[PDB]
């Protein structure tokens, strides 16, 4: 079976993380999203895997990925136009994290066309599956204002080469787009499209807080207590902690699991790591530094007198002493974030900041809830960051 | 003996604490001021205790007090004279001011056995601020001089009386009052002309809770004198405890916490890791004190949380307060002189070289807030991240 | 042999440290610079030592120094030539610049046995900033070129001379006038034409204390080379000590403190709980370092206190300083280039990528103060709570 990972979006909704990396390389603990997808495909015996990517990202993917074909897109309909297969293929959206491979292993043994459905609490935001009374696909309704069902399109398809025929027929939509689901809808009129319901953990990494979501799940479900580092005396560890090689934890550090401490990290003295602290790799967490429910990416340093809660901090970031993130509004309502120029609810009462790569903060910087700081920004000592900060912006 | 507690003042001097509670319910360790008063009255065998309160506070007192009569000051005159106008007794009663904390009950037990009228006197260092007792040469009361500019004596009116129903006769003589005030002491002065008013001098600890810093005063004394080392909580390893520490039930103290007594840790509190509790830290109940948080000589009331990277010194923080990370209180002027506080619109000295802030109930501070010495923050205020609070903040004010 | 220490400069380049002390009394660990110089002279058998000082500093020197002659630079002419005009000797004398720290005494012990005039040369990496020695082909002194734009050599004038009374004759021949002062080296240049001036090259550690960062330089060297692990204080349990730590008498170190040597903890200091002392922390005497306070590569002078929630890196803090809670020093520029400092009104490079602040005596910072890299704060300054100190602050200035 050939497999195609569709990873050709701009990743705009995931800014500022995607200022410096494609969505497919967002870390989940110590490894990129796309390595999970590949690994799970391979458990099903699939060997021939291709990723479809944008022109601008091709080189990044080639650097990172060894024995995987990388093809540039020449929407999801547009992406599969660059998929070269004769009979049938497995197609997965590249923004998905999924815990289970067996549904995929099943669907690649079917002769018929098939898709995966999953139940979500917000079907409004997705393609909703309407089933006929043999429980095969009737149609996919993109983002219905009144959703007839909880069952959505999971973004996992086993499609026959007949899909190209249906792709050629499509013009549409009212939202000014081609799609992939439009072609499936035409296919379902003439063919029986099976729907396999998916019961495991499923998340699309659409918005920056979803990085926290999947990292928490991974930490809860995919790893187990380990210590390959050096823990000094007077370190207190409760619950599940993963300590990778070369990580150093100094006296007075206090850890309430679950916590992930990546390779080469340097912690303490007198640090406090709270549940769902994910330190991806080579992180510096220093004295009187407290971290909670945050993803802190490769090489980033929080050396002195700082609190990082409910945040995503990208790679190579440095926080001057006394940089603080606010994670709660005064009125305790859900924290709003600007995502592609729309102000939307994160769904979280507690939410900190999203900080791009190579950011530097001066000493005594104050960051407000839900704020995005673009890659390469500088925040000047003492500043109150009360809005989004642009790529490379020097905030004074 | 009937007893009356006079608790019908506005409590304005005690703002912002009294924005959300009557003075009688100011905590002293884990219990309100009035419960001490009631408990000490009961040690003398008194059972019939009434509290006289304002109309607006009646419901609050009823909620809080079980087997105590609550009577409203049947308006509409202010002062202690007006308050005892609602006290219903036939012959004699024990009367105490509801702003007082007193360590000793035995002077009270004595005075309720006397047939004569009697009052308690106590020696203070600042008699200028009080009613001074002038004694005749049989050491009975001559007169009470309210706030004399040149005080003839250290002996003041302690606000504890055993008075006969004749006081009502003298109260009726006293001229009300464009200002709508009636002072009980004016009636006692008329009574002392015609009767022998005995004066029992009180040698124990006595304090009135007049200004917000007096909340620290009495809490300190209580911690020093009324409670003893106890641990009903859960103390992790690598907790360092020196001197006297009271840990109530369900309190959790995490590793790295360092405690220099005397310290009171109220029920359900959550401390540490890596907290520092200095002498005269009083955590009333269900308090959160987190990592890199230091507290010294402060009263932190019910449910209040100081979760990260903060220093709280010489302060009173009321109920349900939340300090954003990095909120700091200044407690010392650069010139090291006494810290001044605005009390009923007058700028006065606290009498303290070290004094922090007084924070009302339900306040929220943003991250990185800076609060200056002697500042009052009204209940329900919100302080915006990074603000420098260099003046008093109003009730419900959003300070930016 | 008579010896003269020339300590009569204004010390302006070392402001703000020299706002309250002469350069001679800058501490190196627990003792002033000049006590090292005296001690090393005495290892050579020298007993008759005189210090030449300014009129304004005479009394300070007399208070501090016991059995040492103190002479004021009479002449109101500035420079080293002017200074030795007040040196009274008949035949020969050892002359040392009072800004020098030197590890070795044996070069001095040799040079005082020579009949000829002699000077000490040392190799430095920045000869541009000093008098460069040009040697003749017998390796004697040809001439000293003050601050040559193109330096012909690494060998500079170390500021250590054994000169004969003939130097006064050459001093009388030389100009002034008065930018533009009387330089001792100009007289040595005339002397070298008529006499053989020997040059002994110095291979040990040599530093002049010219700019405020040099206080860090020499303290680091002293800590690395002159002292060894010791504990005369009281260390509580759960203190972690790595590498070399000197703890002087009466110092107290509280639980949770973490120390990465080398570190000097001076007498009577009070550390912790939960403090972090990083390499090259020098706490000269009676210092307070409190909870959640981190120090690295800094010299903190007598009686100075950093009690809460502060980071002090790559800094010099003078005597009797108090940092309000949450005072932070920045020690790195965003562009990672060398930190610049204003020194006598010229903006120059410190030569350091990491450099914090230089803080004068008796400074007080309010809570939550932010100090930028390379900033100087004059003695007696006050910094208002929440201020961002982004320029130099004057002597006694109230920065708001």
How far is the CA of A176 from the CAs of A6, A77, A127, A170, B221, in angstroms?
A: 20, 13, 16, 12, 75
Q: Which residue in A251, A305, A320 is closest to C292 by CB distance? A: A305
CA distance A11 to chain C (A): 29
Technique used: X-ray
- In the block, tokens 């003792």 appear at C31
Answer whether B297's CB lies under 8 Å from B279's CB: yes
Distance CA(B313)–CA(B372), nearest Å, equals 11
Distance CA(B154)–CA(B121), nearest Å, equals 10
Q: Which residue in C258, C309, C311 is closest to A251 by CB distance? A: C258
The domain defined by C1-210 carries CATH number 3.40.50.1370: no
Distance CA(B262)–CA(B264), nearest Å, equals 7
Q: Tokens for A57, please give them.
A: 């990202």
Q: Is C268 on the interface with A (CB under 8 A)?
A: no
Nearest residue to B308 (alpha-carbon basis) of B287, B294, B292, B321: B292
Q: Which residues of A touch C306 (CB under 8 A)?
A: none
- List CB contacts of A51: < 8 A, sequence separation 6 or more: A4, A5, A7, A24, A34, A61, A65, A68, A69, A70, A71, A94
- List CB contacts of A140: < 8 A, sequence separation 6 or more: A127, A128, A129, A130, A153, A181, A184, A185
Pick the CATH number of B211-400 from 2.160.10.10, 3.20.20.80, 1.10.3720.10, 3.40.50.920: 2.160.10.10
Q: Which residues of C touch A320 (CB under 8 A)?
A: 330
Burial of B105 (0-12, 13-18, 19+ CB in 10 A): middle
Containing H/E element for C5? Answer: strand C2-7
Size (chain B), residues: 400
CA distance C274 to chain A (A): 7
Distance CA(A288)–CA(A303), nearest Å, equals 9
DSSP state of C23: G
Dihedral of CA atoms C3, C4, C5, C11 in degrees, nearest 10, equals -170
DSSP state of C37: H
Percent composition of chain C: helix, strand, coil (DSSP 3-state, to 5): 20, 35, 45
- In the block, tokens 């206090």 appear at A254
For the domain made up of A1-206, give the CATH fold. Spore Coat Polysaccharide Biosynthesis Protein SpsA; Chain A (3.90.550)
Three-state helix/strand/coil letters over C313-345: ECCEECCCCEECCCCEECCCCCCCCCCEEEECC
Q: How big is the CA angle at A79 (ends A78 and A84), to the nearest 5 degrees?
A: 110
Best B236, B238, B240, B353 member to test C by mutation, with max C CBs in 10 Å, is B240
Q: Which residues of B touch C236 (CB under 8 A)?
A: 240
Q: Tokens for C153, please give them.
A: 């050599």
Q: Is C43 on the interface with A (CB under 8 A)?
A: no
What's the start-to-end Cα distance of chain C, in Å? 55
Distance CA(C220)–CA(B48), nearest Å, equals 76
Q: Is A362 on the interface with C (CB under 8 A)?
A: yes
| CB count in 10 Å sphere of residue B346 | 9
List all residues of chain C from 177 to 196 with a beta carbon under 8 Å from chain B.
none
Q: Is C308 on the interface with B (CB under 8 A)?
A: yes
DSSP state of B14: G
CA distance C379 to chain B (A): 14
E strand map for A233-370: 236-238, 241-243, 248-249, 254-256, 259-261, 266-267, 272-273, 277-279, 284-292, 294-296, 301-309, 312-313, 318-319, 324-325, 336-339, 342-345, 354-355, 360-361, 366-367
Answer whether A290's CB lies under 8 Å from A268's CB: no
Q: Which residue in B309, B372, B388 is closest to C309 by CB distance? A: B309
Q: Tokens for B12, please give them.
A: 């304005």
Distance CA(A32)–CA(A38), nearest Å, equals 10
CA distance C238 to chain B (A): 8
The answer, yes or no, to whether the previous bond of B16 is cis (omega within 30 of 0) is yes
Which homologous superfamily does the CATH classification assign to the domain defined by A207-396?
Answer: Hexapeptide repeat proteins (2.160.10.10)
Three-state helix/strand/coil letters over B202-270: ECCCEEECCCCHHHHHHHHHHHHHCCCCEECCEECCCCEEECCEEECCCCEECCCCEEECCEEECCCCE
Q: Is A305 on the interface with B (CB under 8 A)?
A: yes
Answer whether C136's CB lies under 8 Å from C45's CB: no
Question: What are the extents of the domains in chain A?
Answer: 1-206, 207-396
Nearest residue to B209 (alpha-carbon basis) of B221, B225, B199: B221
Distance CA(B385)–CA(B399), nearest Å, equals 10
Answer whether C187's CB lies under 8 Å from C141's CB: no
How far is the CA of B342 from the CAs of B316, B350, B391, in angstroms?
A: 15, 10, 10
Answer whether A304's CB lies under 8 Å from A290's CB: no
Residue by residue, DSSP assigns A166-218 as HHHH----TTS---SHHHHHHHHHHS--EEEEE-S-EEE--STHHHHHHHHHH
Query: Hey, is A126 helix, strand or coil?
Result: coil
Distance CA(C6)–CA(C182), nearest Å, equals 14
- List CB contacts of C309: < 8 A, sequence separation 6 or more: A288, A305, B292, B294, B309, B310, B311, B328, C291, C292, C293, C325, C326
For CA atoms C56, C60, C61, C67, the dihedral sign is positive
Q: Name beta bridge partners: A5.
A: A51, A92
Containing H/E element for B6? Answer: strand B2-7
Alpha helices, DSSP H, located in C177-247: 184-194, 213-225
Size (chain A), residues: 396
HSE-up of A243 (CA within 13 Å, CB side)? 19
Query: Hey, is C144 helix, strand or coil?
Result: strand
List all residues of chain B from 214 to 253 with a beta carbon under 8 Å from chain A.
236-238
Minimal-distance CA residue of chain A relative to B384: A330
């Amino acid at each position: 079976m050939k497999a195609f990972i569709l990873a050709a979006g701009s990743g705009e909704r995931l800014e500022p993380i995607t200022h410096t990396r494609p969505k497919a390389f967002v870390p989940i603990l110590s490894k990129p999203l796309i390595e999970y997808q590949i690994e799970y495909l391979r458990k099903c015996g699939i060997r021939d895997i291709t990723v479809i990517v944008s022109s601008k990202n091709k080189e990044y993917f080639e650097k990172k990925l060894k024995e995987i074909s990388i093809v540039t897109q020449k929407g999801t309909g547009a992406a599969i136009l660059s998929a070269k297969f004769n009979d049938e293929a497995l197609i997965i959206n590249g923004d998905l994290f999924f815990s289970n491979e067996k549904e995929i292993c099943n669907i690649i043994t079917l002769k018929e066309n098939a898709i995966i459905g999953v139940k979500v609490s917000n079907p409004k935001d997705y393609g909703v599956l309407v089933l006929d009374n043999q429980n095969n696909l009737s149609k996919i309704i993109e983002k219905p204002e009144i959703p007839p069902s909880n069952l959505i399109n999971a973004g996992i398809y086993k499609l026959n080469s007949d899909i190209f025929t249906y792709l050629d027929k499509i013009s549409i939509s009212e939202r000014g787009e081609l799609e992939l689901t439009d072609a499936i809808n035409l296919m379902a009129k003439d063919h029986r499209v099976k729907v396999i319901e998916y019961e495991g953990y499923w998340m699309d990494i659409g918005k920056p807080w979803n990085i926290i979501d999947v990292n928490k799940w991974a930490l809860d479900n995919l790893v187990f207590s380990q210590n390959l580092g050096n823990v000094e005396d007077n370190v207190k560890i409760k619950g599940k902690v993963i300590i990778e090689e070369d990580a150093e934890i100094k006296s007075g550090t206090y850890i309430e699991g679950p916590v992930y401490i990546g390779k080469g990290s340097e912690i303490g003295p007198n640090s406090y790591l709270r549940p769902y602290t994910i330190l991806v790799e080579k992180n510096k967490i220093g004295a009187s530094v407290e971290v909670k429910e945050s993803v802190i990416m490769e090489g980033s340093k929080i050396p002195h007198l700082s609190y990082v809660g409910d945040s995503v901090i990208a790679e190579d970031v440095n926080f001057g002493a006394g940089t603080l993130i606010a994670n709660l509004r005064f009125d305790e309502k859900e924290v709003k974030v600007n995502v592609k120029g729309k102000r939307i609810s994160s769904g979280r009462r507690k939410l900190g900041a999203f900080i791009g790569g190579h950011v530097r903060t001066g000493i005594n910087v104050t960051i407000l809830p839900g704020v995005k700081i673009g890659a390469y920004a500088r925040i000047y000592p003492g500043a109150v960051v009360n809005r989004d900060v642009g790529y490379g912006e020097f905030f004074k």
